[PDB]
Amino acid sequence: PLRMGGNGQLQYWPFSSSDLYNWKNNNPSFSEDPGKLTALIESVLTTHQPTWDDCQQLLGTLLTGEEKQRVLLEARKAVRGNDGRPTQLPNEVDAAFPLERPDWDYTTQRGRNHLVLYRQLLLAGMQNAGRSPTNLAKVKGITQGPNESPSAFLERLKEAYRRYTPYDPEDPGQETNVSMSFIWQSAPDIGRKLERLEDLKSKTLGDLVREAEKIFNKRETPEEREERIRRETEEK
Amino acid sequence: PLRMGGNGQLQYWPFSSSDLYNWKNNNPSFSEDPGKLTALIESVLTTHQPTWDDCQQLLGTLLTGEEKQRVLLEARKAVRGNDGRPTQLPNEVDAAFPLERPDWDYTTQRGRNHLVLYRQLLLAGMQNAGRSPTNLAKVKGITQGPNESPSAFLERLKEAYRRYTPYDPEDPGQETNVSMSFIWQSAPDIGRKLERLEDLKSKTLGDLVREAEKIFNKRETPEEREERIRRETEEK
Amino acid sequence: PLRMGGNGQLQYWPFSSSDLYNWKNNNPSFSEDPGKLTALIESVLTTHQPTWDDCQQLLGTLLTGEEKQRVLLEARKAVRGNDGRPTQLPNEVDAAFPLERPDWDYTTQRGRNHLVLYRQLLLAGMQNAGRSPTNLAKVKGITQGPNESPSAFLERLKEAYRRYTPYDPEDPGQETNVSMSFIWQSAPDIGRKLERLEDLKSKTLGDLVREAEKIFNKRETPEEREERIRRETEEK
């Protein structure tokens, strides 16, 4: 890790093994649920400002051999040339994301910039390695459970988009797409009412969740329903 | 109708009733399939350069009383103020889309500009009146038939988006949304292969149609299949 | 451990015993799987910049008496003279990799260089001690499992090369050799297709893995197969 010392100079210290093992033990494996470790590592990359060697310990400790490999190749595939486009030119790929220890000096602006880029590419690698073979059926299979809140259902639906499509459900250009899945795959009472909303085209994903919550939050308690039935007094 | 005369001056002539009645008789009613008459009228608005009175004959002849009313209110709802935003200010609405004969003189740039705008708003009115209550189930219900070509299926899917959602399936921002429905609702053999395409995220709607056609075009003729079976020679 | 202090001077602190014991407890023994501890120690040698005494604690804590001995003799066997060749000259061997505490002063370039070399030789020792009696049958016995991904299979195949041959499967000169084992020992459907690839000679190990993944990723789901069978409608 690196931190700005009291003297205005970066200061280095190695990761405590307790932190590394705690991070490992409190999360699923990367393969089981890539989002978990990816989010943890994204955070650490910022708070701990790891050097290249530190990143090797992170990866080496939190990922299996096969996972790390996937991530590293994905990171190298994320390198861009000075024209902002992908590049497979060995020297450019090696310079951005070296597989062997680089001579980066954190006391230099040059070293720092490489470290920044390296960390950014590492994150990209994990994000992309966390992707699986596109399978739209998995997205269509996310249906709101009878007790499931609209916001909880939406999070599961977004997770399926992330895992099983190339589309980022948080992109502004995907909003109507996620919105349509949300409406279609909500519980039937909710979906029928969302479909009938006035100025439906104008509803954001957040609007739709709030409208679904109004219906859900109108759940009509089991006790209440039973009481009504009892007071039914209509016989056959 | 108006046309540029041989002397560089606009020339007026009334619609032949044969054209009006032919247009009516060769198309479904607006209610049955709004796209038909809307496209015909959009074309005529250009080729025939109708005046306000001509537009009344068009509407009066091709639409029922109830359809025309819907269209006219939809057209007035499409009027924009000078700030490009909707306006319900009577004077602005009346000036753009008058319900009673205006004093527009086609020999004046002023008259011509009003005519242009009027025609544009009329078209907008028809496009919007042609919309129905949002019903996502209708879009999910468009499934490729066993003999249906991928391009024919895509056109039916787009028609459902137009009729039963507020989303324009031709908008660039809707492409991934339409693409996902196209993949999910294609015939199962096709959908499974489209889902497995390399660099799926990179495929346009046109790309997906071409890939689906390759599979469809690999239909494996009934005769061929039967022949194979005959030459099976595998008994039980 | 050593680290560059805020004053530009190396600073020493002893290993926390919690780190040493955590490293031990979270890994297999060296004998069980040498790669585990070797990779951990390679990392620590960099991040913790251990002195000669620190290295004795590392080895003493993570290895058994018999393992440490193997490693130390292997490290001394890795010493090179100034002509880049092996040397068994006592003074040269002792100077590079001393068995008794040396007078290396980390505040001197002389001391630092010896420390660098010592750590490099220690790593070499572990890498070589981790080797076992050459046994090609073990490499031929690595066969892809029916559920095993091509990348997971390749990692197991490389592990067998490391453990049971003198060849480094990551060497550029071994690529065709590993490639041929990969093709021959892949699952039969995959191997038959890899063998038929156009311009096979041009395929890297990475290319072959990607081609095998396309076949594997075409696994034809059990459910799918069953469905097909049901819809078979061919009786006997």
Residue numbers in the entry:
A (entry chain B), B (entry chain A), C (entry chain C): 1 to 236
What does the study report here?
The CA domain and immediate downstream residues mediate protein interactions in the immature shell, and, following proteolytic cleavage, CA forms the mature viral capsid.
We applied subtomogram averaging to obtain a density map of the CA hexamer in the core of the mature virions at 7.2-Å resolution. As previously described for HIV-1, the mature MLV CA lattice is thinner than the immature Gag shell, consisting of a single layer including CA-NTD and CA-CTD. The hexamer–hexamer spacing in the middle of the mature CA layer was 10.0 ± 0.4 nm, consistent with previous measurements from HIV-1 (28), and larger than that in the immature virus. The CA-CTD interacts at the twofold axes via helix 9 (black arrow), as seen in other retroviruses, but also via interactions between K201 in helix 310b and D171 in the loop between helices 8 and 9 (black arrowhead). As for HIV-1, in mature MLV, there is a CA-CTD–CA-NTD interface. The observed density extends beyond the C terminus of the truncated protein used for crystallography in a short rod-shaped density toward the center of the core (red arrowhead). Three of these short helices cluster around the threefold symmetry axis, bringing their C-terminal ends toward one another (red arrowhead, triangle).
